[PDB]
Amino acid sequence: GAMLDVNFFDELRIGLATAEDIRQWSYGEVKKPETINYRTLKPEKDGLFCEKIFGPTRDWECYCGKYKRVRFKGIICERCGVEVTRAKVRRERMGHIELAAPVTHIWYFKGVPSRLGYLLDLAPKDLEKIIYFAAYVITSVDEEMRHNELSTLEAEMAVERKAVEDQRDGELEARAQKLEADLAELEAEGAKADARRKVRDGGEREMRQIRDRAQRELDRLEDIWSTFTKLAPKQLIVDENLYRELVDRYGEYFTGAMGAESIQKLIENFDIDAEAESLRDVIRNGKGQKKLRALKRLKVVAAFQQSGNSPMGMVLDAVPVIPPELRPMVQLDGGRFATSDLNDLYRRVINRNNRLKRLIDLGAPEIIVNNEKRMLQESVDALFDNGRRGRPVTGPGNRPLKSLSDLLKGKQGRFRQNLLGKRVDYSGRSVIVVGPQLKLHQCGLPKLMALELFKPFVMKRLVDLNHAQNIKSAKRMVERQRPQVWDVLEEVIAEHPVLLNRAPTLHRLGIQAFEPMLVEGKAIQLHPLVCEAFNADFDGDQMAVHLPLSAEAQAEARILMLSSNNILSPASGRPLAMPRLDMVTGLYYLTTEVPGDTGEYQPASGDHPETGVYSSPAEAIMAADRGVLSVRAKIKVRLTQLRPPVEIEAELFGHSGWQPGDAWMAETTLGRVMFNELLPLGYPFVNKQMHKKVQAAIINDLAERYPMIVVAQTVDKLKDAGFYWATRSGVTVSMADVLVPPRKKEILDHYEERADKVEKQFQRGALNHDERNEALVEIWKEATDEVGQALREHYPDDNPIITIVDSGATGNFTQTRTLAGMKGLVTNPKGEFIPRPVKSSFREGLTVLEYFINTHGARKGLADTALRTADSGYLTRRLVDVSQDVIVREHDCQTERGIVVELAERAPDGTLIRDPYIETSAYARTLGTDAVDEAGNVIVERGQDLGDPEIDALLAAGITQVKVRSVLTCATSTGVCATCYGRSMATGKLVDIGEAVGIVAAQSIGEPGTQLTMRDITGGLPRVQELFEARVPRGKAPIADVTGRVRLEDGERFYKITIVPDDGGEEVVYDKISKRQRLRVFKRVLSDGDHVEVGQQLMEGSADPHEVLRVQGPREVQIHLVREVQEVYRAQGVSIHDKHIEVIVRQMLRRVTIIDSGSTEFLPGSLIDRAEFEAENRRVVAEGGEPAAGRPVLMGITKASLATDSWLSAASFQETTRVLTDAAINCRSDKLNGLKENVIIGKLIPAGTGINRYRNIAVQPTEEARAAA
DNA sequence: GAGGGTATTCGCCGCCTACCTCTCCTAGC
DNA sequence: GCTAGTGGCGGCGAATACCCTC
RNA sequence: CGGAGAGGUA
Ligand SMILES: [Mg+2]
Ligand SMILES: [Zn+2]
Ligand SMILES: [Zn+2]
């Protein structure tokens, strides 16, 4: 189509290659297994590197050397024969090998299912025997001629059989006469009875040998006749002697062969139309296992019939040879070559082919030629796919060689290693340290790394400023780091954004852009407020630096990716660039009121006025400086630049407003005034202690009510203040600060008494081992709880450890109890708790037998963490692949469908109680219908963001359920619409028209997978994986399918649950339910004669998603999956909005399984996209309506990912070989419409700024501005 | 003998990202 | 220096090997 | 800088 490659690509088509195509690609034949000569280091003629085939190895030079100049361009030498051109041609030209005998392609013979087996209806064992010269096969037979000749051959064989058996009978009669002669011989004298019996035994055993000879000969002839009369094509005849007799006796009437030539002949004499008709007939009739087999056979046969591709491409008469530059051979230090693996395999193929050709030409017996053909077959199989059949062809070191099929597969294959990822220029790396002085949009960049990244710009500026005369002088000056380059570098790097990235890149904010500023040193200075987004600490981490070059790239880095523009988490909307650790401690210390402190407010005592009231915060600061006042002492202050709270403002000023400069008396501490002076001017005064949650709420309010620049400046100011006041907060660690509970011994003795009583009861006969273990795990659990409570009560409120934990900065109280109380219960290699506790704390020091088990547990945890981090990445990759083409495409589909969210179900006594999980279900959603209460007017209009004010108004009005728009019900053909998706969690506004929401959903789901532990029902990451893979749950719990009463039965190892429907049409029963599982409690436990719902879950466990779809419908399975995943994630304390899970679940429900094909071309049991199915049915009903009937189906992420319309995307994901062979057989054409495909071919992705409406903007000055010039 | 089921059994596919340092590379005539 | 060649495990689907009547 | 192996960092 487009020759080598030229822009305006339209499609990428694949198919089977014929021998004619292979010989057309070829520039010449390879017929010598010689790579390079050692005496001259030049390619050998007709070898794997021959220059007459693959082109010159030097620019405009010939092998002989007659022409060695650019003038002799395009002329083929008359002596050497190598065309004079550039040396890059060796990367493009291919050769070929002319095989002496036909060979099969291993992909279409050995790959399960064997496609040759389906095409020819031969079992894989028959193909194994025939292909590798182990059994003959009948290729043809002449029926009419053989029948007409049989009409006489029957009599002829009868005649010869009669002749043979009559000769045998004559021989036996002669033997009888000889027996009579022997009788006379032994009767001539006095013989022995035993001697008579011995001679009789000899005679009769010879006679029986004759009888057995007759029987065996007749069996041979009868078998030959039976084989011939019912002989048919595609029959294997082992026992070469039988086939030899068949051909000798009946040379004509048929043709038998062996090897790949026989398969080629069979494919030649094979009409596809008749086979397809027979398969379709067997499908429409018959039913059963035959129909099941015919379905697959027809799949392959229709694949070969619909297209204009012949099936004769499975047998190869020639082998292409890859260009030399793609399989180079290098030389080790000294001059010894390290040959590649491809060269060795090509060499073996060439050797075997040449020797086979020699034997064939010279003449040889059948056996040797067949052996050589088999070895050639095996050599070509090893070349194409090494190790698929038989032992791998190994090289030195007993390691299997690489094949052509290993260059495309795996984590190190072509796709995932070279096309989906690359190594790039203008990039560096070093260690990261902390720069507190930076701002949220700045980073410190080492001078030596900046000089190298910005080398061309510095050279250009050096030439411009007359420091060098040409570019070479400037380049040398930069290489030598002369003192004149730093001054120009300072100005060159000004306002040039730089991208920073830290691996692993779990979510979007792992890459962010900053404004570089040169620093002294070799480590990068990172802002403290981006560590959470990067997940970076400063114990040795390293980061990578990338430099955008073009104007568009700089614009993207400066607008889309700037660090100060990404404050909120895209997964949940919570702020990520907010104070933590030291900053939280400092702010918590500052904004704390300690009763009875210095300079505290004092009411009038009847002899002096009130004490502790100040006329301004400046006076309070002066008093604090003098040491008369404390920053944490309650006072009365007059404030004029701080806005009063809502209550004070309403009851003090009214209507008009605060109008900065109005004085009001505040009753707070000085630290709170200092904290409130760090917030925007119009923000109401906050009088509270700043726990981390209070700060998070403040930041969320600022983000949702102010522009992001104000938020960035506010977080910078809070960082400064927190770091300043954490130094003066007086938090340290000393063994005097680690207080021990004052009565640990008493509690331990009290519970040891209980343990002793239980142990003695066990010693007596009252309870078995398990009861004792459970009782001892209890008692000790309560002892640990009581010790923790005593420890908490003992500690003062201002202890550094208590302050750090309670401030929300970091840590929890379990660690505090372990450090100062007692560790408690440990776990056995199976996970169960040991009945013996660890009564020592790390302040006292564990003993040697309490340390051994502790180390056991710690190492077990570390290993589990490693396995979990390995397991989460695979799920993230699958999630990304399944939903990579879900992109916002419209603004509104104007659909009337939606979903209902509970939104604070009501109380029984009568009251509205807010649903706990409301921010991940109801917020950031658009209304689908107007909300009305008790026939009143609408409370919230259709198409409302439905934020906090809207939800509060809805709750006040007394309405619980509201219908909202969801992607599950979006009507857009491709992608989704902005209104259905709703608010963007990162931005806080309606999502844009180019936003790629599938990748965001995948990254949001997959990122918190390590926190979510991998803990007979699955309960963690395995549970999530089985939910997303649509597998059978494991502990499957049956669900009813028709409302009615139940006749529960009680028994051992089985329960009989019978559904007696209200209609009574039929009764369903479940009898295999093992007694291990309990019975679910719904509405009291399930009991006999109890009415149940249609979708009720009878037992206790996890219901499979496939039954709920078959019984209740798609919406029910959607809500089921969303609820299950959300609960699995909530159990660990992770908040993800439901829209991401909805995106994934939408991607999982997109196809329908066919039942009746009708006039349509869809085969039964095929998965067809719902839109395509509906379009085909609507087209068909117009003309001779015979519409197909289909049913909804649920597919896992892997199946939905591998059932794509692009063979390139599917091959770059998994199972490259199977996908490629199927695509080649079906002759699939790839329309390059997708993110991964455009990434592979190096084109602008169809999302974001690469969309047509954005990339085609036209810019021009206004007429007035143009005139003003 | 001949349709209807098997009914395990075996083979193939999958198993996180980024970086740094160092040693060795065929046997026989 | 040159020439030749008996320490992974789960999930899924096709395939033999096996009756089971019939 | 082609391949194999060993060790280490986050
Ligand atoms: Mg670290
Ligand atoms: Zn020449
Ligand atoms: Zn929509």
Coordinates of C-alpha atoms and ligand atoms in Angstrom, one line a residue, chain A residues 62-67 77-82, ligand 2:
Chain A
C62 CA 31.4 -2.9 -4.2
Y63 CA 32.7 -6.3 -3.0
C64 CA 35.4 -6.4 -5.6
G65 CA 36.1 -2.6 -5.3
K66 CA 35.7 -1.6 -8.9
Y67 CA 33.4 1.3 -8.0
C77 CA 28.6 -3.9 -10.8
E78 CA 29.5 -6.2 -13.7
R79 CA 32.2 -8.1 -11.7
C80 CA 30.9 -8.6 -8.2
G81 CA 27.2 -8.0 -8.9
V82 CA 26.5 -5.8 -5.8
Ligands
ZN2 ZN 32.4 -4.1 -8.3

